[PDB]
Symmetry: D2
Subunit: 80 residues, 4 copies
């Protein structure tokens, strides 16, 4: 069947307090050449396949659960 | 400037309670064609080339903070 | 619009002289730490909203042009 | 060991003749929803770990062989 990977990232225009806290921790570890950190979501979905189209299925699952379209962009991969 | 995306997931010999809660959530929405859900971390770093080897720098950050080497695996991407 | 990236690669069970030539070339350039080289195909397509299923579209485009289903594997991305 | 993938494509300020040919064939196959086609190179390399920095290594292999510095762009992926 299908192995779909969905990547979710906060649109550039939005701020990321968690990513900044991490960056700070990295500076706290002397890894001070990290001028900025961004934290997103990564998902591996093993999809069978029903009377529903692959693109519609993934877009629906993304557009309403896996992601919050007013703060995060996404892209996805597929391989059988 | 190097853009460094790190992808951490969880060994395949490790359960993913978080992924399960999601599969269940997706099924309740009729997306019953999801056989499994693994949830991972995606991180975009912005590095300013220093006196430290890039591969050395990335390996250390992942191994010491970004990815728990005991229950997770990782890979990364580099771009200028 | 769909920015779509398909990746065609020779199956592991197939030999790749081109890759082995490039690897040799590298060795000549003193990079002997390269124990192997595989050369694949990278296509970046822009697809408009179609009445057809994206996965279905790509599979067909590969099976009959972008990929020789006899010696190559593929995968793809969508944005 | 290191599985290294280098992705060379062609700068966007350059035409992709090889792609237009591909686009045409697809349109002839009736797949007219194809608005454009850019073709690139995919390369999987297995590299022994050395004192050398992967980034430097890759950068160099590209500047002199894998990728034409004048008309192409590259990025890469690393996994142990």
């Amino acid at each position: 069947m299908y192995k779909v990977k969905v990547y979710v990232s906060l649109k550039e225009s939005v701020l990321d307090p968690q990513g900044s806290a991490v960056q700070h921790a990295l500076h706290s570890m002397t890894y001070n050449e990290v001028q900025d950190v961004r934290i997103g979501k990564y998902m591996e979905l093993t999809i069978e396949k029903s009377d529903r189209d692959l693109d519609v299925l993934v877009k629906e699952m993304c557009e309403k659960l896996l992601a919050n379209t007013v703060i995060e962009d996404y892209r996805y991969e597929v391989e059988e």
